[PDB]
C-alpha cells in the first residue's frame, strides 16, 4: 500500500512481543524469497498441469 517513493512503513508492537514479531517478519521475508527463487529456478517444457 505504501507505494510512493521513500514511503514509510511503521509497525507498532510491545516490548514483550518484539522477538516474536521480529521472527514473524523474518519468516515472511524468507517465504517471499523462497517464492521468488522457486519461480526463478523451476523450468518446465509442458508449462501446464
Amino acid at each position: 500500500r505504501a507505494r510512493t517513493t521513500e514511503a514509510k512503513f511503521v509497525l507498532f508492537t510491545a516490548d514483550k512481543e518484539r522477538e516474536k514479531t521480529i521472527q514473524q517478519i523474518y519468516q515472511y521475508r524468507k517465504a517471499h524469497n523462497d517464492i521468488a527463487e522457486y519461480l526463478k529456478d523451476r523450468v518446465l517444457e509442458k508449462t501446464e498441469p
Binding site: 511503521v10 509497525l11 521480529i22 517478519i25
Partner: protein
C-alpha cells in the same frame, strides 16, 4: 522458574520412593470458551496441591511443580507515561 518437566520429576519421586503414583483430578472448568481457565489437582498420600492455567497441560504442569516444591520444603489510577526519546528502529 519452571525450567524443566516438573510432572516427570514428581512421578520420579513417587515411583522411586515407592510412594503412590501421582493422581490427577480436574475439578472446575470456568470462563468463556476463548478464556476458559483450567484447574488441575494432584494428590499423593495426604498432600493435595492446586495448579491453574489457560490449558489443562499448563495447569497440570503448574500443579505438579507446586507440589514438587511442597514435598521438598516439607519432607494506581494513572497510566504510566512514555518517554519522547523513542526512535524508529529499522527491521
Amino acid at each position: 522458574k519452571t525450567v524443566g518437566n516438573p510432572i516427570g520429576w514428581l512421578q520420579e519421586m513417587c515411583m522411586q520412593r515407592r510412594w503412590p503414583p501421582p493422581s490427577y483430578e480436574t475439578e472446575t472448568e470456568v470462563g468463556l470458551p476463548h478464556e476458559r481457565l483450567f484447574t488441575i489437582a494432584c494428590s499423593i498420600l495426604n498432600y493435595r496441591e492446586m495448579g491453574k492455567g489457560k490449558s489443562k497441560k499448563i495447569a497440570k504442569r503448574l500443579a505438579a511443580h507446586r507440589m514438587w516444591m511442597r514435598l521438598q520444603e516439607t519432607p494506581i489510577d494513572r497510566y504510566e507515561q512514555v518517554s519522547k526519546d523513542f526512535e524508529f528502529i529499522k527491521i
